[PDB]
Structure formats: C-alpha cells, structure tokens
Design a protein around this ligand. Structure first.
Ligand SMILES: Cc1noc(C)c1-c1ccc(CNS(=O)(=O)c2c(C)nn(C)c2Cl)cc1
Length: 250
C-alpha cells in the first residue's frame, strides 16, 4: 500500500488552476505571454500555500522558506507543466492550464517557440520513463530543496534532514513498482539525473524571464505584483550564478 507521506503529498496537491485566458480573441505573442504571467501569479500563490502544508518545510527558518521558494519557483512550474502535459495530453501539447493548452500552431514567435521546445523535454522524459504520480510528488519536493545560497541556509541541519527524508521517500516511491535492487537503483539514477538536468533547462527560462521583464513595456507584456517581486528579489543574482545548485551526480 501507499506510504503515508506520499498519501499526504497527494492530498496537499493544489487544485486545478485556470489561467483566465480570454479564449475568444486570437494570440499575439504579448497577450499569450501576459496570460502565462497571470497563470504564473496564481501558481505562485498555490506553491506558497502548498509549502505551508508540506511536512518539514514550515519548521525551517522563515527566511529559508522564502529563499527556497524564490529560488525554485521556475523549476516547480516547469515540472508541473510537464506532469500536466504528460497526464492530460500524452506529452504532445503543453498543458499550462485547462484553458491554456498550447500546440505547435499557437507558438508563432520563434524565441517563444524555442523556449517551448526546451520546456517540452520534461513531458517527453516523463513519457519515456513512465514517471508515476508517487515519484513525481517526491521529485517535486526535491526540486523545492534543490538550490541553496552560497553561504547555506540558516536552518541548514533541518534542511538537510528534510531533503534526506524526501530522498528516502522517492526510493520508497520507486519500490512501489520497481522491484529488485538493480532495477530500483538504475531507476533512482534516472529520476535524479532528470532533476540534475533541470538546472540547465531552468537557466534558459530564467534568462528569458528577466529579459522579458526588463523589456516588459516595450513588449507590452504584463507582470503581476508577486511575480515581479520574486524576479526583482533574486533572478539577477540567480542568473549571475550566485547560488549553489544541489546535484545528485558529480
Ligand atoms: C505558468 C507556468 N507554467 O509553466 C511555466 C514555465 C510557467 C511560467 C513560468 C514563469 C513565467 C514568467 N515569465 S516568462 O519568462 O515570460 C515565462 C517563462 C520563464 N516561461 N514561460 C512559459 C513564460 Cl511566459 C511565466 C509562466
């Protein structure tokens, strides 16, 4: 049967989040980007709410909690996108929200299309690996815990205990299906290498975000208030490499 912590993770998953996209009039790049930003503002709230129910997290110093969220928001959102796209449309469209699903036709702008192809590697890997919901839920928590400041965290001990606990839980998740030590271990390698590889992908999304943000008035792209602050607070420092990404492999 399903381990308790995984059952809890399932129960604290956010409910479906709508973009609120005006689905009548057609896409310009800038209107589509505004909708994505509006959706991202709703997803950020939902990430912050989720984190308050996530076992272990609230017990870290409040500054660590804020930092871990500001560092991981993009990863969490690309990972969420991959899962939904995998689950709902067999990884063959980008399922941002039920009212915002993008197929190839709706990605005109080449820079944005390039970005979408990059994000698309995640749903493709989920399909290839056949990631279970149980593995995903533990992987997601490890993403929240996958980048820390160069100095480390105020609650460094508690943080490392928490990360360890979700790594064991992922190994439990893997065991639900993957029987046998060699298959289990190869599977662990694969899923944690996927997490390692997300740092690279996410760096491209970070740069595109800060660019679009600085140029927002020239592009007519709207950035809501909470998103604007996470970007202003941390994105230049993150892009400048002034953070320590955690890696499962050398
Ligand atoms: C929402 C959502 N779901 O997955 C992703 C990725 C998002 C998302 C994440 C971040 C942002 C911030 N603005 S943005 O740079 O213009 C951007 C990024 C980064 N990705 N996308 C799809 C956009 Cl628009 C907007 C949407």
């Amino acid at each position: 049967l399903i381990p308790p912590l995984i059952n809890l993770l399932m129960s604290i998953e956010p409910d479906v989040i709508y973009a609120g996209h005006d689905n009548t009039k057609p896409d310009t790049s800038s209107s589509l980007l505004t909708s994505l930003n509006q959706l991202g503002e709703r997803q950020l709230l939902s990430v912050v709410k989720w984190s308050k129910s996530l076992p272990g997290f609230r017990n870290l110093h409040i500054d660590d909690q804020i930092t871990l969220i500001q560092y991981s928001w993009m990863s969490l959102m690309v990972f969420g996108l991959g899962w939904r796209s995998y689950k709902h449309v067999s990884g063959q469209m980008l399922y941002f929200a039920p009212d915002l699903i993008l197929n190839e036709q709706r990605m005109k702008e080449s820079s944005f299309y390039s970005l979408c192809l990059t994000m698309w590697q995640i749903p493709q890997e989920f399909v290839k690996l056949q990631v279970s919901q149980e593995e995903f839920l533990c992987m997601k928590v490890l993403l929240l815990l996958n980048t820390i400041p160069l100095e480390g965290l105020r609650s460094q001990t508690q943080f490392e205990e928490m990360r360890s606990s979700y790594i064991r839980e992922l190994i439990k998740a893997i065991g639900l299906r993957q029987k046998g030590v060699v298959s289990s271990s190869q599977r662990f390698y694969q899923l944690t290498k996927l997490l390692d590889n997300l740092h690279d992908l996410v760096k491209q999304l970070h740069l595109y975000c800060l660019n679009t943000f600085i140029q927002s008035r020239a592009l007519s792209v709207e950035f809501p208030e909470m998103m604007s602050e996470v970007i202003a607070a941390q994105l230049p420092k993150i892009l400048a490499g002034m953070v320590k990404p955690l890696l499962f492999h050398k």
